[PDB]
């Protein structure tokens, strides 16, 4: 396994950001790539040995470090918004009959103003009686709104067990104020069950959203609660 | 060395032919790889061309043929399955094992279109929030939900949900607003079947 | 019924932290990779006009050779390499003619480890201008070869010595050359 | 000074008659002693000394590793042969020939490749007795040299000729010397 310290990061512009990648397989080779829509994976930097730095295909804006063999750190001197992306780290050895072992990846969003960060509000809307009568199925809808940046993981839980069948979440949020550069997002999702299942008052449905925001180290002095990583959920019970 | 993946987004109806393109540039003996990124997980090696053979059989039913003449290594599957929806990445390397630097293509997102068995469009209303939400569902795969009129009315894109245990699939789109003059009768304007219920 | 041979030769020596990577064709160096500047150095410039080689790739092999040397050292329970002294020879590129530019060749052969001090001496004093050398070249018995060159103007008034120091010799080795 | 430890690795591609026959030999050498090798004509790694058995056993157990090595004769050897063919297998530099007294010395230098034939003649007759050569000398810069001496007490009216045959020349070179 190749581990990347954090899975999500919100950083401010002009700041110096550190992304870590640690491997324990004694691999001589390590690489840093970024994954962006329509651009696939692009190589930033890589190392074939200790103290070995080699510019990849898109070095600009980044620097790197490999003082120890297990660690390959990616550095952003002065983070700019264009550097908002998902960074993948991979390691391997030229002396091994196989290739890449990928890391978890770390979502990094760099914004100008941290006071723009906001947790989501979550709400569950119960099935339409009309739909139940018409199709014998019940569609619950979940709405996660007002969040920024777009660092969320929405999930449905029925009777305390995370469910996947019958669920459809939007591939991406939609800006509440399209034109704005610092726009909050909204995400929706569906959970469809049989009418019978929903008409059972014993069944419990919960829409849960994990929001990844500011960290313990980030400074905060605004009246509202600090926009830290947190879980926001809403629930509903079967109804006859 | 380089790779190109013509077609960033590819739609395929299930049971139909899946073809994901990959062309390469190599001034040396090529080693190609196809990686897949299924929803909510990391890249998996699907298959790789190590020059052993020319027709490479991969996991999950995929196949790829290395054509030195066309300079291609396309990925195919006769019958698209719903669980094939993901991003597919082509890669080229100079290492026989893929352990030295890899150069990835631009990737293609594969969407599988469901053969809606018993279509019957409809717009239902459902009830801490301040929004009212309408659900446009069970319509046909030939229906395209358009964006919104009021900048104050939010309409998501259409998405498919698979109720496995029942073998049922459905398309849906959600709309909502906190606007007083917002009912489900008009929420969706723009080419919805004259047949859907309310 | 032999005809040709291409050899990819690399090594890593320990206390020294020294490693090399090169290609050989029938005894001649095609190119070698300079670990510091991370570049491919062609033996003859003309070669680098018709071919290329990704140097980074060598840095990768060396990193694995580093790890392999450590594993083998322990497997052999820290058994040191046995020194084998060089055989030194000095000769010129072509027949010597006073006033006509020539080149003194100092050929160090059949020695190991790959560590040598080579000094050209003209009338006792060190000479460095114009000198050049090769990397440690491969031998079928796994010992090494090395060449040092000294361009010079033949004269009745000059004397030359090639001084070679190696951990396998009890004392520096001086090979002499002079216009007959 | 203190103890040295050396690790050497050699990948040898042997070509016979172009690339009609090719043999790949991978060699691992610790402190000048080869411990394990892969010989393309054997098909798998074999220990040369007991120190290399762990490696032979380990590498032979990986189907993919053996797969790549068995095809290296093509993906590695034949490929690199074609890359340097124009400046290696086909390199040709003509010999500079000079003859001078000492013994009659025929100096043949600056030539490539290494196979050369040097002969001595006296009044049109080949002198095959009393000839001496210091052998082919590799200069280490892609050129060779050699010295072929003839034991003779140079006499007048006598003609001595050095004949050189080499791939770089269509008609043999000859340098004669008289007194």
């Amino acid at each position: 396994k190749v581990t990347q310290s954090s899975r999500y990061l919100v950083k401010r512009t002009g700041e110096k950001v550190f992304l870590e990648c640690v491997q324990d397989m004694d691999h001589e080779n390590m690489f840093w790539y970024r994954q962006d829509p329509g651009l696939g994976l692009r190589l930033i930097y890589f190392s074939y040995d200790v103290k070995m730095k080699e510019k990849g295909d898109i070095p600009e804006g980044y620097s790197v470090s490999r003082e120890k063999k297990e660690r390959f750190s990616l550095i952003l001197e002065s983070a700019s918004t264009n550097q908002t992306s998902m960074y993948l780290c991979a390691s391997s050895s030229t002396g091994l009959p196989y290739g890449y072992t990928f890391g978890s990846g770390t979502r990094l969003t760099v914004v100008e103003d941290l006071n723009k960060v906001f947790p989501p509000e979550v709400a569950v809307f119960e099935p339409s009686e009309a739909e139940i009568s018409h199709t014998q199925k019940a569609t619950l809808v979940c709405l996660a709104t007002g969040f920024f940046p777009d660092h969320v993981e929405l999930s449905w839980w029925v009777n305390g067990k995370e469910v996947h069948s019958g669920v459809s979440t939007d591939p991406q949020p939609l800006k509440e104020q399209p034109a704005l550069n610092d726009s909050r997002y909204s995400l929706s999702s569906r959970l469809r069950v049989s009418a019978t299942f929903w008409q059972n008052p014993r069944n419990h449905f919960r829409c849960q959203v994990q929001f990844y925001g500011l960290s313990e180290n980030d400074e905060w002095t605004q009246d509202r609660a600090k926009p830290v990583t947190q879980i926001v959920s809403a629930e509903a019970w079967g109804r006859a | 060395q380089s790779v190109t993946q013509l077609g960033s987004h590819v739609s395929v109806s299930e049971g139909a032919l899946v073809l994901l393109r990959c062309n390469y540039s190599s001034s040396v003996p090529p080693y190609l790889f196809w990686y897949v990124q299924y929803p909510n997980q990391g890249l998996q090696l699907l298959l790789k061309y190590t020059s052993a053979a020319t027709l490479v059989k991969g996991i999950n039913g995929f196949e790829a043929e290395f054509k030195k003449s066309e300079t291609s290594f396309h990925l195919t599957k006769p019958s698209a399955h719903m669980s094939d929806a993901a991003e597919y990445f082509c890669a080229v390397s100079e290492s026989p094992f893929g352990n030295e630097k890899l150069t990835f293509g631009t990737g293609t997102r594969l969407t599988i279109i469901p053969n809606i068995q018993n279509p019957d469009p409809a717009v239902y209303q459902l009830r801490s929030s301040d929004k009212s939400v309408c659900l446009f569902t069970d319509f046909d795969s030939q229906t395209n939900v358009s964006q919104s009129k009021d900048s104050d009315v939010y309409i998501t894109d259409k998405t498919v949900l698979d109720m496995r245990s029942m073998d049922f699939k459905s398309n849906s789109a959600v709309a909502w607003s906190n606007k007083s003059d917002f009912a489900c009768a008009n929420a969706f304007n723009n080419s919805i079947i004259p047949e859907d219920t309310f | 019924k032999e005809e040709h041979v291409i050899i990819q030769a690399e090594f890593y020596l320990n206390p020294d932290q020294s490693g090399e990577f090169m290609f050989d064709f029938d005894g001649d160096e095609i190119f070698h990779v300079d670990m510091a500047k991370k570049e491919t150095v062609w033996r003859l410039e003309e070669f680098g006009r018709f071919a290329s080689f990704e140097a980074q790739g060598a840095l990768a092999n060396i990193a694995v050779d580093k790890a392999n040397l450590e594993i083998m050292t322990k497997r052999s329970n820290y058994t040191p390499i046995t020194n084998v002294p060089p055989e030194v020879t000095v000769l010129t590129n072509s027949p010597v003619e006073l006033r006509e530019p020539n080149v003194l060749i100092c050929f160090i052969d059949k020695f190991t480890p790959p560590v040598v001090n080579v000094t050209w001496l003209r009338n006792g004093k060190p000479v460095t201008t114009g000198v050049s050398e090769t990397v440690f070249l491969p031998r079928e018995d796994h010992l090494f070869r090395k060449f040092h060159y000294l361009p010079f103007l033949p004269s009745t008034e000059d004397v030359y010595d090639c001084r070679v120091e190696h951990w396998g010799l009890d004392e520096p080795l001086l090979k002499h050359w002079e216009f007959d | 000074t203190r103890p040295r430890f050396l690790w050497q690795l050699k990948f040898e591609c042997h070509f016979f008659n172009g690339t009609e026959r090719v043999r790949l030999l991978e060699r691992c050498i610790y402190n000048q002693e080869e411990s394990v090798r892969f010989d393309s004509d054997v098909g798998e790694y074999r220990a040369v000394t007991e120190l290399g058995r762990p490696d032979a056993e380990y590498w032979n157990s990986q189907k993919d590793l053996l797969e790549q090595r068995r095809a290296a004769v093509d993906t590695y050897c034949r490929h690199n042969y074609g890359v340097g063919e124009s400046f290696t297998v086909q390199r040709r530099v003509e010999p500079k020939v000079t003859v001078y007294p000492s013994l009659l010395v025929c100096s043949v230098s600056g030539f490539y490749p290494g196979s050369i034939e040097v002969r001595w003649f006296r009044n049109g007759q080949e002198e095959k007795a009393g000839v001496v050569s210091t052998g082919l000398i590799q200069n280490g810069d892609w050129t060779f040299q050699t010295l072929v001496m003839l034991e003779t007490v140079p006499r007048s009216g006598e003609v001595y000729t050095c004949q050189v045959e080499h791939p770089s020349v269509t008609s043999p070179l000859t340098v004669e010397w008289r007194a």
């Binding site: - | 100079e94 | 071919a51 392999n68 | 691992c28 290296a72 690199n80």
Partner: peptide, 13 residues
């Protein structure tokens, strides 16, 4: 043309 190297293999541990 481009020369191709052969990768060194890591020793058994």
């Amino acid at each position: 043309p481009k020369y191709v190297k052969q990768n060194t293999l890591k020793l058994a541990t």
